[PDB]
């Protein structure tokens, strides 16, 4: 057992001041070279310091936890149109959430605005919008295999603004008949 | 410190980087555990995220806020929207670089910030050059075809990344005038 | 530990026979090792090194003898072993040339002119 | 201590902050040189007056010097006090006892001034001539290749034995190439006219390549082409378009 | 201690050993733990490091009476000879990391071959200063002493001599093929007779000039 | 433990010293065999009793090779 353990791979992390054959003691990384765990701990410390300096009338609801992938599934469900457990119709995460979230909250505000199959040309025009809602519904569940969080924000930036353009055309009364038929022309 | 720089630099800034419209991004900077070593790297990195936010803010401000319609060319016009259109496509490799860094951080997060500055050093030169090009257009309220000249004197450049970056956007602005020319002629 | 079970590991290191295959050589090994377990010549880890140095000067590789003094000094520098005479005496007994007389060069004490 | 303990583990926390050094290494004179030099002083009866220094360990110095050399400024040693960097004089290591330390670090400071100056010159581009703009571009292109090797040495500090003479010797073929830029920029800051400021810069490099007409010469070559790049453009324009256009004539012949 | 010594022998002065321009690296500290004879030992050791220090200064300026690309080639050969002295200085640190019991003598031992190399080239370096050689006679003043008397100083100077031949392989390629001289400092024009090394004959030197002139026409 | 690791480090040093000593005394052993011998004389056993065994066992494997 002792000589089965003997066959160790000898020390090279050996300081110049240490001549007593150290096995190593871990070079002790840089301040930023811990930022997956020390970052989260510092996040917790920084928030709690803010809470003490305010009085404790802020009281964080844990905007950290959950981590990455579960939220990717949650926002993917928002792309179906059903909202997250945070929304209705780290702490930096709130900003990243809100930007992609407002697109889905507009996707729902388009789908209930298209409940008709009066106004014949208005009905046909409305079905033309449903044909785009199906496109937005079709891009999700094919392109993501559950990618990273930031890919969602970047990738749906070039596309979500195009959706948001279409809400300006809609109201969310509105011209119908010859008025719409000439206005759209 | 590793992930958080991505969360700041992506344009969805946190509370560590309180965004002001007169200083851009700035780290919280009040710790007995923050050193001058991180400070300079952080301050170098702050410029790039401030520039990205201003760029995306400009593009959003002038694209997707009207259908297509002041008659002032410094605030409105098809050439300007074509400019914004070119700019976002130019902004794409920055996003690609950020996602590229993210994957390796998920693999091993103990990589240093100096490597991040080392990677992002190539955009560190490119962003301030194009900043003055958009700033002039906004400042002088330049109308119509004169906007085409303003980039053009700056697209006879002497740095390959800057010149090549502005040249494609000028091609977009050519195309819209070509389309109107295809009617009037 | 037990010195008896350790003997068969040597018989499976030298010959490629399995542990339930070699029982003849380990039988003979019990004959030689058993009742020759206590020392019959005095312990000297100093003198065995001083007789390798004698051999190394005799072959006129005098730089290797000063290398061996360093190896002996590293042996003393660690100091984990209980009997350092035995392994060096064992390495000396199994010697072969890398590539004359020793009846006039001194042997060791018989433990009859020393204590029995 | 829930924040302090986690810091103490994975980050250093004893010399860029006010704290005494607590790390019992191996003692015994070959690395106990600070204390034995003190005791030798006191036995020789100076007479006394203890000096207060932090007694930082060794490898930290290597870290600081690398980060300084790669291009960023403002570290805990080599703070500039007049525009020339100066090591913090309250810093001592367990060997070399504050006098030889200042000698090797003053030799490093001599190289650091050139990089600090060139970094500052580039910093003033972030803050018509466009030959200076074409100068900083080539300087920049060298700098990325420089920073690559500096960062490569930083990668292996996370893994090895760490002392000064190894990493200095590894950076020997980059401090050699560095010396040329102190002379080409000196004639690039030796200047009135925008045409003499470019020509006097340009003729230095042609003379230096004809001197060796290696590795310095590849540097000079890569800098030569990136500085003669404006002139090829202007002469090409003048030939094909039949007119000389230039905002603020940087051209030798007046029309 | 064993890094302070191993920089004091290098270009750094030391704070135990006192540098001086008359002669430096002088032991001037008394310790109870070092035997009283050790200083004498030290002094012989110091005879090495002095030369290296002086050598570096002469190399620092280069790499009228004393100028030219030859002086940037001789000095480079002087870099080359100090190169295994550099490597055999890092190896000692590596040894001392493991072993704490090694005596001073092992240093003294291992670099005793450069206590013959270094002083006997110093006389060549001073000879090149007192006589203002910068021309083609630098190959001459190497070539008489490249014969040597001891085998280390026989190879070191071969290393230096090769580069000075290599320059004249550039001058005589512009000359005998393109008909070009004066691509460098000197030493219808012709070769100066006084700068020729004696082991190159006058007749061959004539033939070279005739070949170079006939190309131009 | 920490000192038990550095002790184990020093035992690797000693078995490498003994490996140098074996290779210039040019024995038939490898590392793992002399480790077993080190166990044998750590508990106390005769080198003159082990040597006769190793000397016939190395000759009783060329007898049916």
UniProtKB/Swiss-Prot annotation, chain C:
Top-level division of the source organism's lineage: Eukaryota
Record localization: Cytoplasm, Cytoskeleton, Microtubule organizing center, Centrosome
Sites of Phosphoserine modification: 100
Disulfide pattern: none
Function: Component of the gamma-tubulin ring complex (gTuRC) which mediates microtubule nucleation. The gTuRC regulates the minus-end nucleation of alpha-beta tubulin heterodimers that grow into microtubule protafilaments, a critical step in centrosome duplication and spindle formation.
Subunit structure, as described in the record: Component of the gamma-tubulin ring complex (gTuRC) consisting of TUBGCP2, TUBGCP3, TUBGCP4, TUBGCP5 and TUBGCP6 and gamma-tubulin TUBG1 or TUBG2. TUBGCP2, TUBGCP3, TUBGCP4, TUBGCP5 and TUBGCP6 assemble in a 5:5:2:1:1 stoichiometry; each is associated with a gamma-tubulin, thereby arranging 14 gamma-tubulins in a helical manner. Gamma-tubulin at the first position is blocked by TUBGCP3 at the last position, allowing 13 protafilaments to grow into a microtubule.
Family: Belongs to the TUBGCP family.
Protein name in UniProt: Gamma-tubulin complex component 3
The gene coding this protein: TUBGCP3
Full-protein interval shown: 7 to 129 of 907
Curated annotation (Swiss-Prot), chain D:
Organism the protein comes from: Homo sapiens
Family membership: Belongs to the TUBGCP family.
Membrane-spanning residues: none
Included range, full protein: 210 to 496 of 1024
Tissue: Widely expressed, with highest levels in heart and skeletal muscle and moderate levels in brain.
Assembly and oligomerization: Component of the gamma-tubulin ring complex (gTuRC) consisting of TUBGCP2, TUBGCP3, TUBGCP4, TUBGCP5 and TUBGCP6 and gamma-tubulin TUBG1 or TUBG2. TUBGCP2, TUBGCP3, TUBGCP4, TUBGCP5 and TUBGCP6 assemble in a 5:5:2:1:1 stoichiometry; each is associated with a gamma-tubulin, thereby arranging 14 gamma-tubulins in a helical manner. Gamma-tubulin at the first position is blocked by TUBGCP3 at the last position, allowing 13 protafilaments to grow into a microtubule.
Protein name: Gamma-tubulin complex component 5
Subcellular location(s) per record: Cytoplasm, Cytoskeleton, Microtubule organizing center, Centrosome
Job of this protein: Component of the gamma-tubulin ring complex (gTuRC) which mediates microtubule nucleation. The gTuRC regulates the minus-end nucleation of alpha-beta tubulin heterodimers that grow into microtubule protafilaments, a critical step in centrosome duplication and spindle formation.
Swiss-Prot record, chain E:
Tissue: Ubiquitously expressed.
Domain of life: Eukaryota
Signal peptide range in chain numbering: none
Pathological condition linked to this protein in its record: Microcephaly and chorioretinopathy, autosomal recessive, 3: A disorder characterized by congenital microcephaly and chorioretinal dysplasia associated with poor vision and nystagmus. Variable ocular anomalies include microphthalmia, retinal folding, retinal detachment, optic nerve hypoplasia, absence of retinal vessels, round areas of chorioretinal atrophy, and attenuated electroretinogram. Most patients have mild developmental delay and mild learning difficulties.
Native organism: Homo sapiens (Human)
Biological role: Component of the gamma-tubulin ring complex (gTuRC) which mediates microtubule nucleation. The gTuRC regulates the minus-end nucleation of alpha-beta tubulin heterodimers that grow into microtubule protafilaments, a critical step in centrosome duplication and spindle formation.
Entry's localization field: Cytoplasm, Cytoskeleton, Microtubule organizing center, Centrosome
Family assignment from sequence similarity: Belongs to the TUBGCP family.
Name of this protein: Gamma-tubulin complex component 4
Swiss-Prot record, chain F:
UniProt keyword annotations, A-Z: Acetylation, Cytoplasm, Cytoskeleton
GO CC list: centrosome; cytosol; gamma-tubulin ring complex; interphase microtubule organizing center; spindle
Function: Required for the recruitment and the assembly of the gamma-tubulin ring complex (gTuRC) at the centrosome. The gTuRC regulates the minus-end nucleation of alpha-beta tubulin heterodimers that grow into microtubule protafilaments, a critical step in centrosome duplication and spindle formation.
Nucleotide-binding found in the keyword field: no
Broad class of the protein's primary localization: cytoplasm
Gene name of the encoded protein: MZT1
Protein source organism: Homo sapiens
Signal peptide residue numbers: none
Compartments it resides in: Cytoplasm, Cytoskeleton, Microtubule organizing center, Centrosome; Cytoplasm, Cytoskeleton, Spindle
Family: Belongs to the MOZART1 family.
Assembly description: Associates with the gamma-tubulin ring complex (gTuRC) consisting of TUBGCP2, TUBGCP3, TUBGCP4, TUBGCP5 and TUBGCP6 and gamma-tubulin TUBG1 or TUBG2; within the complex, interacts with TUBGCP3 and TUBGCP6 to form a luminal bridge with actin that stabilizes the initial structure during complex assembly. Interacts with TUBG1.
Protein name, per record: Mitotic-spindle organizing protein 1
GO biological process, one term: gamma-tubulin complex localization
């Amino acid at each position: 057992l002792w000589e089965a353990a003997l066959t160790y791979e000898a020390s090279k992390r050996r300081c110049w001041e240490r001549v007593g054959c150290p096995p190593g003691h871990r070079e002790e990384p840089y301040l930023t070279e811990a930022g997956r765990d020390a970052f989260d701990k510092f996040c917790r410390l920084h928030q709690g310091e803010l809470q003490l300096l305010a009085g404790g009338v802020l009281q964080a609801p844990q905007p950290v936890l959950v981590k990455e992938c579960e939220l990717v599934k949650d926002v993917l469900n928002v792309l179906i149109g059903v909202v997250s457990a945070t929304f209705s119709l780290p702490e930096s995460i709130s900003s990243l959430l809100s930007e992609v979230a407002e697109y889905g909250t507009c996707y729902t505000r388009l789908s209930h605005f298209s409940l008709q199959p009066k106004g014949l040309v208005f009905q046909a025009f409305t079905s033309g919008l449903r044909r785009y809602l199906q496109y937005y519904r079709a891009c999700v569940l094919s392109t993501p295999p559950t990618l990273s969080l930031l890919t969602i924000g970047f990738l749906f930036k070039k596309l979500g603004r195009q959706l948001r353009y279409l809400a300006e055309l809609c109201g969310v009364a509105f011209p119908t008949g010859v008025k719409l038929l000439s206005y759209l022309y | 410190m590793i992930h958080e720089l991505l969360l700041a630099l992506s344009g969805y800034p946190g509370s560590i980087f309180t965004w002001n419209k007169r200083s851009g991004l700035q780290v919280s900077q009040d710790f007995p555990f923050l050193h001058p070593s991180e400070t300079s790297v952080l301050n170098r990195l702050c410029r790039l995220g401030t520039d990205y936010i201003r760029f995306t803010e400009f593009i959003e401000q002038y694209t997707g806020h009207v259908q297509q319609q002041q008659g002032q060319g410094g605030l409105h016009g098809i050439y300007l929207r074509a400019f914004c259109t070119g700019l976002d496509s130019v902004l794409q490799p920055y996003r690609q670089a950020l996602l590229d860094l993210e994957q390796e951080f998920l693999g091993d997060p103990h990589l240093s910030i100096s490597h991040v500055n080392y990677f992002l050093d190539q955009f560190q030169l490119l962003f301030p050059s194009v900043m003055v090009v958009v700033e002039q257009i906004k400042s002088q309220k330049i109308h119509g075809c004169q906007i085409l000249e303003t980039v053009y004197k700056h697209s006879c450049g002497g740095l390959p990344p800057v010149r090549s970056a502005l040249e494609k956007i000028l091609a977009v602005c050519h195309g819209v005038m070509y389309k109107q020319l295809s009617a009037w002629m | 530990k037990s010195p008896n079970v350790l003997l068969q590991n040597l018989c499976c290191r030298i010959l490629g026979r399995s542990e339930a295959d070699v029982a003849q050589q380990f039988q003979y090994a019990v004959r030689v090792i058993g009742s020759n377990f206590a020392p019959t010549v005095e312990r000297d880890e100093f003198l065995v090194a001083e007789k390798i140095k004698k051999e190394l000067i005799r072959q006129r590789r005098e730089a290797d003898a000063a290398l061996f003094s360093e190896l002996h000094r590293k042996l003393h520098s660690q100091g984990v072993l209980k009997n350092k005479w035995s392994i060096l005496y064992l390495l000396l007994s199994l010697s072969e040339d890398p590539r004359s007389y020793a009846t006039l060069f001194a042997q060791a004490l018989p433990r009859d002119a020393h204590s029995t | 201590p829930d924040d302090r303990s986690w810091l103490e583990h994975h980050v250093v926390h004893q010399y860029w902050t006010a704290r005494p050094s607590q790390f019992p290494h191996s003692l015994h004179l070959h690395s106990n040189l600070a204390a034995v030099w003190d005791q030798h002083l006191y036995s020789s009866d100076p007479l006394y007056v203890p000096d207060d220094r932090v007694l930082v360990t060794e490898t930290q110095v290597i870290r600081e010097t690398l980060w300084l050399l790669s291009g960023v400024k403002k570290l805990f040693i080599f703070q500039l006090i007049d525009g020339k960097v100066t090591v913090r004089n309250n810093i001592i290591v367990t060997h070399l006892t504050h006098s030889c330390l200042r000698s090797v670090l003053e030799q490093i400071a001599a190289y650091g001034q050139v990089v600090f100056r060139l970094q500052e010159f580039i910093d003033e581009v972030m803050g018509p001539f466009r030959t200076y703009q074409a100068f900083m571009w080539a300087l920049y292109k060298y700098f990325i290749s420089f920073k690559e090797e500096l960062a490569e040495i930083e990668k292996c500090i996370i893994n090895t034995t760490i002392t000064l003479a190894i990493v200095v010797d590894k950076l020997a073929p980059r401090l050699s190439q560095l010396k040329v830029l102190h002379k080409v920029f000196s004639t690039g800051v030796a200047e009135t006219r925008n045409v003499v400021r470019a020509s006097h810069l340009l003729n230095t490099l042609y003379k230096a390549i004809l001197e060796y007409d290696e590795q310095t010469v590849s540097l000079l070559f890569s800098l030569w082409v990136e500085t003669v790049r404006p002139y090829l453009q202007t002469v090409d324009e003048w030939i094909v378009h039949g007119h000389l256009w230039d905002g603020a004539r940087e051209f030798i012949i007046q029309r | 201690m064993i890094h302070e010594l191993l920089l004091a022998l290098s270009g750094y002065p030391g704070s135990i050993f006192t540098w001086n321009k008359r002669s430096g690296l002088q032991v001037s500290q008394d310790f109870p733990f070092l035997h009283p004879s050790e200083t004498s030992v030290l002094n012989r050791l110091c005879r090495l490091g002095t030369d290296y220090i002086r050598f570096t200064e002469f190399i620092e300026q280069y790499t009228g009476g004393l100028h030219g690309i030859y002086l940037r080639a001789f000095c480079t050969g002087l870099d080359s000879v100090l190169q295994p002295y550099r490597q055999a200085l890092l190896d000692l640190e590596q040894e001392f990391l493991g072993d704490p019991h090694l005596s001073i003598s092992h240093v003294n031992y291992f670099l005793d071959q450069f206590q013959l190399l270094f002083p006997s080239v110093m006389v060549v370096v001073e000879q090149i200063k007192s006589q203002k050689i910068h021309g083609c006679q630098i190959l001459e003043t190497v070539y008489k002493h490249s014969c040597g008397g001891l085998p280390p100083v026989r190879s070191a100077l071969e290393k230096i001599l090769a580069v000075c031949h290599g320059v004249m392989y550039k001058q005589l390629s512009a000359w005998m093929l393109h008909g070009l001289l004066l691509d460098q400092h000197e030493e219808q024009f012709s070769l100066r007779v006084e700068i020729l090394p004696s082991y190159i004959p006058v007749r061959v030197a004539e033939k070279i000039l005739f070949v170079g002139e006939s190309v131009q026409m | 433990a920490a000192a038990a690791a550095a002790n184990l480090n020093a035992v690797r040093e000693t078995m490498d010293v003994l490996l140098e000593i074996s290779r210039i005394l040019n024995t038939g052993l490898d590392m793992e065999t002399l480790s077993i011998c080190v166990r044998l004389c750590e508990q106390g056993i005769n080198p003159e009793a082990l040597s006769s065994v190793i000397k016939e066992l190395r000759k009783a494997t060329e007898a049916l090779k």
